[PDB]
Amino acid sequence: QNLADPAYRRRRIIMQNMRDEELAIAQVEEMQAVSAVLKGKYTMTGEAF
Amino acid sequence: MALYVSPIVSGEVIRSRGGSTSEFTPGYVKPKHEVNPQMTLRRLPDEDP
Amino acid sequence: HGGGSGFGGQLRSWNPPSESVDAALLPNFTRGNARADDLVRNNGYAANAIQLHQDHIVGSFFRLSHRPSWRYLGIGEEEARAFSREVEAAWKEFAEDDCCCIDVERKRTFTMMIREGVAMHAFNGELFVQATWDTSSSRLFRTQFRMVSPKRISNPNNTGDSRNCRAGVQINDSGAALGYYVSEDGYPGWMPQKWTWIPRELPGGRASFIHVFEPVEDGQTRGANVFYSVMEQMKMLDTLQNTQLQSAIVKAMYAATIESELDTQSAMDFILGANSQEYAAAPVRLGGAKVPHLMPGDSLNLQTAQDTDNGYSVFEQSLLRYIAAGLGVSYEQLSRNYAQMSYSTARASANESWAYFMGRRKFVASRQASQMFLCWLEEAIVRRVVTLPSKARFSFQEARSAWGNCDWIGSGRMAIDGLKEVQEAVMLIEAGLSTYEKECAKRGDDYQEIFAQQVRETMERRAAGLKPPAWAA
Amino acid sequence: MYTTAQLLAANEQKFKFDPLFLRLFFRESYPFTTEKVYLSQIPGLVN
Amino acid sequence: QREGINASARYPKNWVTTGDPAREFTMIQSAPLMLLADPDEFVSVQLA
Amino acid sequence: QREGINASARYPKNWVTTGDPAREFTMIQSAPLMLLADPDEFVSVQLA
C-alpha cells in the first residue's frame, strides 16, 4: 500500500547490514571467552589466516 | 561469522537478508434474523398476566 | 492527505530523504560555498545584496555602551558609572586606533571586523575569529583578532566525518564543540595542506576561538548561507539575461540583406555603392539616401528584427521579486527600481527591511562584538589598566557576563521624510514616554556625550557673549 | 492484477544469544599499543 | 590510522567503489584477545 | 586541472586507495624547466 524510495530502501539495508555485522563480531568475540573458560587453550584458526 | 580473516585478504561478503509472504483474504460472517410481527400477539414467558 | 502522494499521482515520484541538516549540508558544504562565492563575485545582484547588508546591519560606525550589572553585583552607581566611562574610553581609544594593529593582518579596523564578520556569516552561514595574544610589548594591549574563512576549517587530511569529528570540529557527546581544526593558506595549492588543532576555549577561561552562526535545528555544527534557497535561481537568471542580451545583439546585428544572382562585388557596388575603385569584402561609406536600381530578379529585403523586451523586463521584475523574497531584502532595495511607489508602501517596505536587519544585527554583530569586548576587557583587567572596585561581590571571572554587559549602537534609521520622525521623536520626549538615551541610540549617538557637547557649546557661547543656547536655567 | 495485498506484520524470530561471560568474568577492557603482549605468573612453592 | 585511533574496540568504515558498476560497503575491524589471569582458578570437567 | 592551480613549482598530494588494502600514497609532482637567458654569458673551460 505504501512503497519506499530506493534511497530509503538502501538506508534500511545499511541498517540491517550494520546490525548483522555487530552481531557477528559479538558472536566471534564470545568464542575466545568460551574457549578460555572451557579449557584454557584457544586456537585462533581460520581460512586465509 | 567472519572468523579470523587476516588483515590483507578480506575477501568475501555475506548475503544481506529477506524473504517471506502470506495471503489470507477476508473471512466473512452475516447471521441474519427476522421479526414477523404476527408472533407479537401471544405474550412471551415473562410479562405476567 | 496532502503529504501522501498528491492529486492524481502528481508528486508520485518525489520523496525527500529525511535526514538532519548536518547530514544534508556537509556532503556538499564546500560546493555551496563555492557557488555562493562565484555568485557574489560575478553577479551584480549578489554583490549589491551583500553591500546592503554591510551598510545596514552595521554601517559606518559601531559604538559600544557598557552598562554593568551594578545592581546584580551590589555596586554603587557612582563607581559603576566611573568604571563604565573609563573602560569605554579605553576601548574607544583602542578600537579606532590609527595603527591598524588591532589584527595580525594589520589591514582593517574594528568596524571592518564587524562588516567582514557579518558578510561572511551571510554568504557562508557562519563566522570564525581566533583571538591571539602576541608577545610584543610595544603596545599596551597584546590581543589581536584574525578572522578565518570557513574554507580553512576541515578535518585533518580530509578524512571522513564521525560522531565526534564533523568537518574538523571536535565536539563532546552533548554536541558542544570543544576544538577546531584550521588549515593554513593554500596559495598556491602547491604547499602541503596542514591542520592545526585549536581549543575553542582556553583552559584559563579565555575565548581563544569564537564561532558565530544561527542553528535551525538540533545537532547543528556549521551554518548555511542564505543563497542556498536562491543560488540556482539567480545563476540561471544571470545566464538568461546574458543569452537575451546576445540574442538582441545578433538581431540588431543583421538588419537587411540583398538577393541577386550577380557577383557579390558587383552587387555591392551596384546596391550599396561600395568602394570598388579601391577578406573585408567592401566597406560602405555612410551618406545620404543612396537609392539603388536593382535589376529585375533582385531584392533589398530589409528585416524588421524583433522587439528586444518581449516581456523580458516584467519577467525579470518577477524573478527579482522572488530573489528578494529569498534574500530578505526588499525588492526595491535589491533591484534599485522604485516605480509607482506610494508613501505608505515605501514606509512599510522600509519598516519590514529595517526590522529584519535589526534582527540580523542583534543576532550576529552584537554578540560578536560582545565577545571581542569580553576578551579585550579580560586583558585590560589582567593588566590592571583600570581598577576594579574592591566592594565587588563577585570576581571578574565569576561574573564575566555581568561585568561585560554592553550594548551596541549601529547606523540610525534614516527616515524617508525625516521631518515627521524628528517631530514625533520630540513630541514623544515631551510626553515623557521615552528617554534621551533611547532616542540617541536610535539616531546613532549617546546622550552622555550629547550632554557633554551641549555643555561645551553653552560654555563657548557664554564666553563669546553672543547668545545662550536652547538649554538654560 | 487486483492484488493490492496490504502488509501488516514483519516478525523476526531471529536468534537466541547472550554472552554474559564478558560481563561476568572479563569486566575490564584494555586497548593495545605494542604489538606484543606479556603475561607473567609467579609460582610460590617452598620446602 | 589516519585519525590516530590505532587502539579501538570496533572501527566502522564505508566506501563506494568507482567504475561502471556502483557498490559501497560497510566495514568493521577488530582484534579481540580475551584472556584471563589464572587458568587454574576455574575447573571445567566434561560429564557423561 | 579541476583545482585550477596548475602553475607552480612542487605539487603535493597524499591519497588513500579504497577497498580492504586501503593504503596511502604521497606524491610530489613537478615540471621544472629552468634555463638561462644568455648561454654565451657564462664561459666554461675544461682544465688540464
XYZ file of C-alpha atoms in Angstrom:
714
model
C 0.000 0.000 0.000
C 2.951 2.339 0.677
C 6.184 1.624 -1.172
C 9.556 3.196 -0.388
C 12.087 5.096 -2.455
C 15.302 3.299 -3.458
C 17.361 5.586 -1.217
C 15.187 4.696 1.774
C 15.487 1.027 0.844
C 19.274 1.315 0.736
C 19.337 3.077 4.109
C 17.245 0.275 5.602
C 19.579 -2.280 4.015
C 22.517 -0.440 5.586
C 20.784 -0.667 8.963
C 20.313 -4.418 8.545
C 23.904 -4.857 7.408
C 25.476 -2.942 10.276
C 23.305 -4.726 12.835
C 24.212 -8.153 11.490
C 27.885 -7.156 11.373
C 27.908 -6.158 15.039
C 26.024 -9.349 15.900
C 28.662 -11.367 14.041
C 31.507 -9.593 15.807
C 29.896 -10.275 19.195
C 29.390 -13.909 18.195
C 33.024 -14.296 17.158
C 34.403 -12.493 20.208
C 32.492 -14.643 22.700
C 34.339 -17.631 21.222
C 37.542 -16.511 22.931
C 35.721 -16.346 26.262
C 34.112 -19.765 25.910
C 37.362 -21.404 24.803
C 39.201 -19.714 27.675
C 36.830 -20.735 30.412
C 36.241 -24.102 28.973
C 39.807 -25.431 28.636
C 42.279 -22.536 28.924
C 43.533 -23.480 25.461
C 42.435 -21.482 22.441
C 43.076 -21.833 18.712
C 42.685 -18.664 16.642
C 42.456 -20.623 13.392
C 40.635 -19.756 10.193
C 40.867 -19.937 6.440
C 43.064 -17.296 4.793
C 44.767 -16.726 8.133
C 30.854 -15.383 11.272
C 33.913 -13.681 9.751
C 36.131 -15.731 11.933
C 39.797 -14.758 11.654
C 40.490 -13.192 8.248
C 43.999 -11.760 8.182
C 44.046 -8.000 7.546
C 45.242 -8.319 3.949
C 42.834 -10.762 2.345
C 39.377 -9.564 3.461
C 37.783 -11.385 0.554
C 34.109 -12.235 0.540
C 30.908 -10.761 1.960
C 27.616 -12.364 3.013
C 24.024 -12.218 1.811
C 22.040 -9.391 3.376
C 18.594 -10.684 4.424
C 14.995 -11.276 3.414
C 12.113 -13.450 2.254
C 8.621 -14.380 3.492
C 4.979 -13.804 2.469
C 1.407 -14.856 3.293
C -2.127 -14.316 1.970
C -5.497 -14.982 3.641
C -8.167 -12.955 2.057
C -11.282 -11.756 4.061
C -13.076 -14.196 6.298
C -16.833 -13.478 6.487
C -19.974 -13.910 8.606
C -23.503 -12.488 8.350
C -26.004 -14.111 10.733
C -29.321 -12.535 9.734
C -32.568 -12.850 11.693
C -36.251 -11.960 11.321
C -39.202 -10.274 13.044
C -42.582 -11.486 11.701
C -44.867 -9.108 13.652
C -47.571 -11.781 13.761
C -45.772 -13.600 16.583
C -46.029 -10.431 18.696
C -49.659 -11.192 19.590
C -49.187 -14.031 22.083
C -47.082 -12.870 25.023
C -43.688 -14.300 25.992
C -42.974 -16.486 29.041
C -42.365 -13.275 31.004
C -44.907 -10.413 31.130
C -47.104 -11.892 33.871
C -50.892 -11.912 33.353
C -3.999 13.598 2.758
C -1.756 16.311 1.367
C 1.535 14.637 2.244
C 0.696 11.174 0.951
C 1.032 11.135 -2.837
C -0.527 14.224 -4.456
C -3.565 14.689 -6.663
C -3.573 12.161 -9.488
C -0.119 10.951 -8.539
C 1.403 14.337 -9.357
C 4.286 14.254 -6.890
C 4.108 10.461 -7.110
C 7.892 10.118 -7.520
C 9.130 12.826 -5.120
C 10.039 11.973 -1.520
C 12.950 13.843 0.089
C 15.359 11.629 2.042
C 14.569 12.816 5.582
C 17.785 13.487 7.491
C 19.371 16.005 9.823
C 20.515 19.363 8.495
C 24.157 18.429 9.075
C 23.709 15.215 7.097
C 22.067 17.270 4.356
C 24.655 20.053 4.290
C 28.097 18.581 4.991
C 28.405 16.403 1.828
C 28.064 19.481 -0.404
C 29.149 22.070 2.162
C 32.179 23.071 0.096
C 30.156 23.130 -3.129
C 27.581 25.525 -1.708
C 30.289 27.898 -0.515
C 31.978 27.755 -3.922
C 28.732 28.540 -5.726
C 27.966 31.378 -3.313
C 31.425 32.875 -3.838
C 31.068 32.600 -7.611
C 27.671 34.300 -7.469
C 28.821 37.110 -5.184
C 31.883 37.680 -7.374
C 30.307 37.563 -10.846
C 26.694 38.670 -10.224
C 25.904 42.298 -9.503
C 22.742 41.421 -7.588
C 24.546 39.286 -5.011
C 27.200 41.963 -4.536
C 24.516 44.619 -4.091
C 22.703 42.482 -1.523
C 25.924 41.977 0.430
C 26.668 45.704 0.232
C 23.204 46.475 1.591
C 23.895 44.037 4.425
C 27.146 45.820 5.231
C 25.596 49.283 5.078
C 22.510 48.470 7.140
C 23.465 45.810 9.705
C 26.370 47.928 10.969
C 27.021 50.802 8.603
C 29.633 53.488 9.089
C 30.171 53.191 12.850
C 29.561 50.746 15.684
C 29.562 52.274 19.161
C 29.820 50.467 22.486
C 27.732 51.244 25.562
C 28.777 49.209 28.606
C 26.120 49.068 31.337
C 27.443 46.697 34.020
C 25.109 44.729 36.279
C 25.859 47.019 39.204
C 22.652 46.002 40.981
C 23.430 42.308 40.487
C 26.976 42.732 41.818
C 25.901 45.050 44.645
C 27.846 48.039 43.315
C 27.152 51.728 43.763
C 26.012 53.921 40.899
C 28.891 56.401 41.142
C 31.746 53.911 40.890
C 29.744 51.816 38.422
C 29.465 54.749 36.020
C 33.077 55.777 36.666
C 34.246 52.283 35.743
C 31.934 52.308 32.724
C 33.256 55.612 31.390
C 36.885 54.637 31.975
C 36.556 51.264 30.249
C 34.627 52.748 27.329
C 37.260 55.470 26.932
C 39.973 52.814 26.863
C 38.005 50.724 24.372
C 37.303 53.646 22.044
C 40.963 54.650 22.138
C 41.994 51.084 21.308
C 39.330 50.374 18.676
C 39.647 53.276 16.222
C 43.435 53.115 16.583
C 45.154 54.585 13.529
C 47.894 51.952 13.850
C 45.617 49.376 12.204
C 47.454 46.991 14.551
C 44.296 45.506 16.092
C 44.749 42.414 13.912
C 47.671 40.294 12.795
C 46.664 41.042 9.201
C 47.183 44.744 10.025
C 44.805 45.815 7.257
C 41.414 46.661 8.800
C 39.661 48.426 11.681
C 37.096 47.109 14.164
C 34.200 48.367 12.058
C 35.707 46.445 9.153
C 35.923 43.466 11.521
C 32.189 43.630 12.130
C 31.409 44.146 8.443
C 33.575 41.227 7.335
C 32.116 39.002 10.035
C 28.514 39.720 9.107
C 29.292 39.439 5.389
C 30.955 36.043 5.748
C 28.152 34.894 8.041
C 25.698 35.929 5.329
C 27.440 34.359 2.333
C 28.921 31.365 4.169
C 26.497 30.703 7.042
C 28.914 31.429 9.890
C 31.993 33.322 11.019
C 35.176 32.187 12.779
C 37.510 34.512 14.691
C 40.642 33.456 16.571
C 41.919 35.743 19.329
C 45.713 35.587 19.525
C 47.957 37.043 22.217
C 51.184 38.397 20.749
C 54.350 38.547 22.837
C 55.379 42.011 21.624
C 55.225 44.542 24.463
C 55.495 47.598 22.197
C 51.819 48.426 22.807
C 49.514 48.435 25.814
C 47.215 45.639 24.628
C 48.601 42.317 23.416
C 45.381 40.844 21.978
C 44.787 40.624 18.234
C 41.965 39.101 16.207
C 42.118 37.075 12.994
C 39.005 36.198 11.031
C 39.189 32.846 9.250
C 37.170 31.887 6.203
C 35.116 28.705 6.702
C 37.032 27.155 3.798
C 40.043 26.853 6.122
C 38.197 24.720 8.708
C 38.060 20.998 7.940
C 39.074 17.650 9.369
C 42.751 16.662 9.078
C 43.764 15.070 5.770
C 40.164 15.489 4.534
C 39.156 12.398 6.485
C 35.634 11.078 6.834
C 33.370 12.658 9.414
C 32.356 10.823 12.577
C 30.077 11.256 15.590
C 32.562 13.474 17.449
C 34.521 14.739 14.419
C 32.408 16.729 11.948
C 34.257 18.917 9.425
C 37.177 19.226 11.821
C 35.023 20.289 14.778
C 35.883 18.201 17.829
C 32.719 18.047 19.937
C 31.536 16.356 23.113
C 28.640 13.912 23.497
C 26.107 16.709 24.034
C 27.160 18.311 20.738
C 29.069 21.255 22.200
C 32.244 21.949 20.243
C 35.497 21.751 22.173
C 38.112 22.073 19.440
C 38.607 23.138 15.846
C 40.950 22.225 13.002
C 42.329 25.052 10.854
C 44.221 24.788 7.566
C 46.815 27.412 6.672
C 46.936 29.426 3.462
C 46.719 27.409 0.264
C 48.120 29.851 -2.297
C 49.214 28.124 -4.438
C 47.681 24.731 -3.612
C 51.266 23.549 -4.097
C 52.200 23.651 -0.452
C 51.272 20.605 1.672
C 47.999 21.395 3.408
C 48.414 21.123 7.181
C 45.906 21.027 10.032
C 46.320 22.757 13.395
C 44.020 21.973 16.320
C 42.904 24.935 18.438
C 40.678 24.548 21.523
C 37.552 26.691 21.439
C 38.110 27.985 24.981
C 41.408 28.482 26.763
C 41.722 26.390 29.950
C 42.204 29.673 31.798
C 38.720 30.667 30.649
C 39.613 32.906 27.697
C 37.597 32.580 24.483
C 40.553 31.651 22.303
C 38.299 30.909 19.328
C 34.774 32.135 18.595
C 32.351 30.616 16.081
C 29.122 32.510 15.389
C 26.125 31.281 13.391
C 22.388 30.659 13.732
C 21.421 26.976 14.022
C 17.976 25.992 12.799
C 17.673 22.537 14.420
C 19.324 20.261 16.958
C 22.766 18.884 16.195
C 23.862 21.787 14.002
C 27.602 22.227 13.533
C 28.003 24.625 10.590
C 25.922 27.458 9.223
C 24.241 27.678 5.832
C 24.271 30.862 3.783
C 21.050 32.494 2.641
C 21.883 31.848 -1.021
C 21.100 28.121 -0.735
C 17.423 28.793 -1.469
C 18.151 31.182 -4.367
C 21.570 30.209 -5.762
C 20.397 28.204 -8.772
C 17.610 30.686 -9.495
C 19.951 33.670 -9.606
C 22.577 31.740 -11.583
C 20.061 30.781 -14.251
C 18.700 34.331 -14.185
C 22.161 35.679 -14.983
C 22.517 33.120 -17.762
C 19.101 34.102 -19.131
C 19.841 37.821 -19.157
C 23.202 37.168 -20.822
C 21.623 34.993 -23.515
C 18.841 37.523 -24.106
C 21.460 40.253 -24.452
C 23.404 38.219 -27.011
C 20.234 37.384 -28.942
C 19.323 41.066 -29.097
C 22.905 41.715 -30.204
C 22.579 39.425 -33.214
C 19.058 40.652 -34.007
C 20.304 44.232 -34.193
C 23.404 42.958 -35.997
C 21.521 41.602 -39.008
C 19.240 44.315 -40.411
C 18.987 43.968 -44.204
C 20.023 41.543 -46.924
C 20.407 41.541 -50.702
C 19.180 38.847 -53.085
C 20.705 38.644 -56.561
C 22.374 36.136 -58.866
C 25.109 38.604 -59.840
C 28.648 38.560 -58.493
C 28.978 39.671 -54.884
C 31.359 42.540 -55.657
C 29.140 43.873 -58.445
C 26.078 43.555 -56.221
C 27.856 45.554 -53.525
C 28.985 48.315 -55.860
C 25.547 48.493 -57.519
C 23.295 48.350 -54.437
C 25.388 49.693 -51.557
C 27.618 51.879 -53.726
C 30.733 50.378 -52.139
C 34.298 51.438 -52.969
C 35.239 49.084 -55.798
C 37.584 51.803 -57.099
C 39.897 50.979 -54.167
C 38.577 39.271 -46.611
C 36.936 42.620 -45.836
C 34.585 42.408 -48.855
C 33.699 46.052 -49.447
C 33.212 48.792 -46.843
C 30.318 51.158 -47.456
C 30.563 54.889 -46.850
C 27.670 56.397 -44.883
C 25.997 59.335 -46.608
C 22.593 60.317 -47.968
C 19.727 58.104 -49.048
C 21.603 56.192 -51.787
C 18.552 54.832 -53.594
C 19.609 51.790 -55.667
C 18.470 50.494 -59.072
C 18.232 46.748 -58.512
C 17.578 44.940 -61.770
C 14.599 42.566 -62.012
C 15.087 39.371 -60.062
C 16.875 41.199 -57.232
C 15.690 42.273 -53.803
C 16.806 44.526 -50.957
C 14.943 42.794 -48.150
C 15.201 44.939 -45.016
C 14.369 42.810 -41.987
C 12.090 44.153 -39.263
C 14.084 42.431 -36.471
C 12.178 41.695 -33.249
C 11.394 43.568 -30.049
C 14.207 43.250 -27.526
C 12.000 43.213 -24.396
C 9.193 40.802 -25.239
C 8.153 40.536 -21.599
C 11.791 40.339 -20.525
C 11.526 43.368 -18.248
C 8.459 42.132 -16.370
C 9.815 38.578 -16.192
C 12.958 39.989 -14.598
C 10.715 42.009 -12.286
C 9.043 38.819 -11.066
C 12.302 36.875 -10.769
C 13.990 39.661 -8.812
C 10.903 39.807 -6.600
C 11.372 36.121 -5.808
C 15.099 36.645 -5.233
C 14.394 39.487 -2.807
C 11.865 37.278 -1.030
C 14.547 34.635 -0.620
C 17.270 37.049 0.476
C 15.126 39.024 2.927
C 15.982 42.413 1.426
C 13.083 44.388 -0.017
C 12.570 44.240 -3.765
C 13.057 47.954 -4.400
C 16.300 47.974 -2.407
C 17.600 44.900 -4.220
C 16.642 45.890 -7.770
C 17.161 49.676 -7.445
C 13.768 50.184 -9.100
C 11.204 52.322 -7.321
C 8.413 52.960 -9.814
C 4.793 53.615 -8.761
C 5.663 53.815 -5.068
C 3.334 55.442 -2.542
C 4.398 56.938 0.769
C 2.624 54.289 2.833
C 4.023 51.413 0.771
C 7.556 52.806 0.906
C 7.279 53.263 4.669
C 6.001 49.707 5.101
C 8.800 48.238 2.985
C 11.414 50.239 4.871
C 9.900 49.138 8.186
C 9.937 45.462 7.208
C 13.503 45.505 5.896
C 14.663 47.511 8.909
C 13.097 45.037 11.329
C 14.788 42.162 9.519
C 18.144 43.940 9.559
C 17.802 44.836 13.242
C 17.237 41.156 13.932
C 20.296 40.179 11.910
C 22.404 42.842 13.632
C 21.352 41.706 17.102
C 21.965 38.049 16.257
C 25.369 38.436 14.614
C 27.199 41.689 15.182
C 26.020 42.413 18.718
C 27.228 39.058 20.012
C 30.472 39.030 18.014
C 31.383 42.499 19.263
C 30.338 41.475 22.769
C 32.756 38.540 22.681
C 35.550 40.732 21.317
C 34.923 43.277 24.069
C 34.869 40.487 26.650
C 38.317 39.325 25.560
C 39.639 42.893 25.458
C 38.246 43.637 28.916
C 39.744 40.427 30.293
C 43.142 41.572 29.051
C 42.511 45.080 30.392
C 41.643 43.768 33.856
C 44.561 41.337 33.995
C 46.814 44.258 33.032
C 45.052 46.489 35.602
C 44.652 49.319 33.097
C 41.541 50.141 35.152
C 40.855 49.409 38.810
C 38.030 47.066 39.734
C 36.101 48.319 42.787
C 37.006 46.429 45.946
C 33.382 46.141 47.091
C 32.644 43.841 44.113
C 30.735 40.855 45.472
C 31.842 38.569 42.627
C 35.164 38.276 40.837
C 35.630 39.184 37.189
C 35.997 35.557 36.125
C 32.894 34.676 38.142
C 30.754 37.470 36.662
C 32.291 37.766 33.187
C 28.867 38.188 31.591
C 27.769 40.582 34.343
C 30.957 42.643 34.096
C 30.760 42.574 30.301
C 27.148 43.685 29.968
C 27.315 46.041 26.989
C 25.017 47.024 24.139
C 25.854 48.357 20.703
C 24.815 51.364 18.632
C 24.605 50.943 14.869
C 23.620 53.128 11.956
C 20.422 55.016 12.659
C 17.097 54.691 10.876
C 17.200 57.342 8.155
C 13.504 58.003 7.626
C 12.139 58.828 4.186
C 10.584 62.096 5.347
C 12.794 62.791 8.363
C 10.737 65.789 9.453
C 7.920 63.522 10.617
C 10.272 61.254 12.550
C 12.040 64.176 14.234
C 8.792 65.868 15.241
C 7.315 62.612 16.532
C 10.513 61.957 18.490
C 10.476 65.398 20.101
C 6.780 65.199 20.958
C 7.365 61.722 22.406
C 10.160 63.148 24.555
C 7.818 65.918 25.689
C 5.211 63.291 26.568
C 7.994 61.649 28.562
C 7.236 58.158 27.271
C 10.834 57.588 26.105
C 14.344 58.682 27.072
C 17.150 60.750 25.597
C 19.286 57.610 25.744
C 16.789 55.649 23.647
C 16.418 58.482 21.137
C 20.176 58.929 20.733
C 20.652 55.168 20.415
C 18.034 55.135 17.664
C 19.597 58.105 15.874
C 23.203 56.915 16.209
C 24.638 58.703 19.267
C 24.616 58.626 23.076
C 23.058 61.105 25.479
C 26.161 61.250 27.684
C 28.461 62.763 25.082
C 25.472 64.668 23.692
C 25.151 66.429 27.049
C 28.913 66.909 27.276
C 28.931 68.532 23.834
C 25.981 70.745 24.762
C 27.774 71.845 27.936
C 30.818 72.709 25.844
C 28.597 74.613 23.404
C 26.875 76.671 26.082
C 30.205 77.397 27.775
C 31.670 78.626 24.480
C 28.623 80.759 23.701
C 28.626 82.253 27.200
C 32.326 83.075 26.877
C 31.747 84.693 23.484
C 28.795 86.601 24.955
C 26.531 86.312 21.910
C 23.561 84.036 22.632
C 22.638 81.313 25.127
C 21.574 78.031 23.511
C 18.216 76.307 23.915
C 19.088 74.724 27.278
C 19.433 77.060 30.260
C 18.165 77.666 33.799
C -3.925 -7.942 -11.232
C -6.163 -6.627 -8.439
C -3.689 -7.817 -5.802
C -3.076 -4.779 -3.592
C -2.457 -7.059 -0.585
C -1.556 -4.698 2.250
C 1.101 -5.940 4.687
C 0.868 -5.840 8.480
C 3.492 -7.995 10.215
C 7.272 -8.255 9.963
C 8.062 -10.892 12.587
C 11.763 -11.619 13.001
C 12.222 -14.608 15.338
C 15.930 -14.389 14.639
C 18.182 -15.971 17.206
C 18.973 -16.669 20.853
C 22.261 -15.273 22.142
C 23.618 -13.644 25.299
C 27.310 -13.922 26.237
C 27.211 -12.990 29.943
C 30.857 -14.054 30.151
C 32.458 -10.745 29.201
C 30.273 -9.081 31.846
C 30.734 -11.950 34.313
C 34.458 -12.694 34.030
C 36.139 -10.077 31.824
C 34.738 -6.880 33.334
C 37.891 -4.949 32.334
C 38.902 -3.987 28.790
C 42.366 -2.941 27.612
C 43.486 -1.370 24.326
C 46.834 -2.383 22.880
C 49.607 -0.092 21.698
C 52.521 -2.505 21.358
C 52.384 -5.477 19.011
C 53.341 -7.944 21.752
C 51.593 -8.899 24.985
C 53.447 -10.082 28.083
C 51.588 -12.148 30.681
C 53.582 -13.388 33.664
C 52.849 -15.792 36.507
C 54.958 -16.105 39.659
C 54.740 -19.518 41.384
C 55.043 -19.720 45.145
C 56.251 -23.101 46.416
C 58.820 -23.578 49.189
C 60.201 -26.523 51.123
C 45.433 5.004 11.328
C 44.757 8.326 9.593
C 42.918 9.545 12.718
C 45.112 8.149 15.492
C 42.584 5.539 16.627
C 45.139 2.716 16.353
C 43.743 1.139 19.526
C 39.961 0.764 19.471
C 37.198 -1.755 20.064
C 35.303 -1.563 16.767
C 36.091 0.611 13.756
C 33.321 1.333 11.239
C 34.269 2.170 7.674
C 32.402 2.851 4.444
C 33.486 3.476 0.869
C 31.932 3.259 -2.590
C 33.843 1.727 -5.480
C 34.199 3.672 -8.713
C 33.755 2.234 -12.201
C 30.715 1.385 -14.271
C 29.113 -0.766 -11.511
C 28.422 1.200 -8.329
C 28.587 -0.523 -4.945
C 29.603 0.580 -1.456
C 30.474 -1.389 1.657
C 30.248 -1.473 5.438
C 33.419 -2.464 7.268
C 34.019 -3.410 10.900
C 37.516 -4.288 12.096
C 38.789 -5.519 15.454
C 41.310 -7.841 17.094
C 39.807 -9.290 20.277
C 42.221 -11.095 22.590
C 40.050 -12.161 25.528
C 42.356 -13.517 28.235
C 42.305 -14.236 31.956
C 44.687 -14.117 34.900
C 44.639 -17.626 36.400
C 43.512 -20.562 34.233
C 43.917 -22.786 37.301
C 41.238 -20.724 39.069
C 38.419 -22.460 37.182
C 37.698 -26.183 36.967
C 35.988 -27.429 33.802
C 35.007 -31.092 33.535
C 33.026 -32.890 30.852
C 30.263 -35.178 32.100
C 28.813 -38.464 30.880
C 43.007 20.652 -13.717
C 39.848 20.847 -11.608
C 41.602 22.821 -8.844
C 42.883 25.463 -11.281
C 46.300 25.826 -9.661
C 48.261 24.106 -12.415
C 51.092 26.685 -12.389
C 53.692 26.450 -9.599
C 56.810 24.525 -8.567
C 56.061 21.464 -6.410
C 52.615 19.877 -6.127
C 51.995 17.647 -3.086
C 49.224 15.093 -2.788
C 48.516 12.223 -0.392
C 45.575 9.973 -1.186
C 44.054 6.727 0.063
C 43.075 3.838 -2.169
C 39.707 2.242 -1.498
C 38.963 -1.384 -0.684
C 40.364 -3.590 2.044
C 44.066 -2.980 1.237
C 43.354 0.717 1.773
C 46.784 2.338 1.606
C 48.066 5.895 1.399
C 50.335 7.286 -1.294
C 52.318 10.522 -1.175
C 53.235 12.440 -4.305
C 55.289 15.497 -5.275
C 54.767 16.297 -8.955
C 56.736 18.937 -10.812
C 57.606 20.185 -14.296
C 60.882 22.063 -13.760
C 62.465 23.569 -16.873
C 64.985 26.102 -15.564
C 67.008 27.980 -18.122
C 69.327 30.926 -18.735
C 68.770 33.916 -20.998
C 72.297 34.135 -22.458
C 74.206 30.845 -22.783
C 77.284 32.695 -24.034
C 77.325 34.880 -20.912
C 78.903 32.054 -18.893
C 82.186 30.623 -20.192
C 83.247 27.051 -19.421
C 86.768 25.646 -19.724
C 87.938 22.064 -19.204
C 91.087 22.409 -17.116
C 94.060 20.221 -17.992
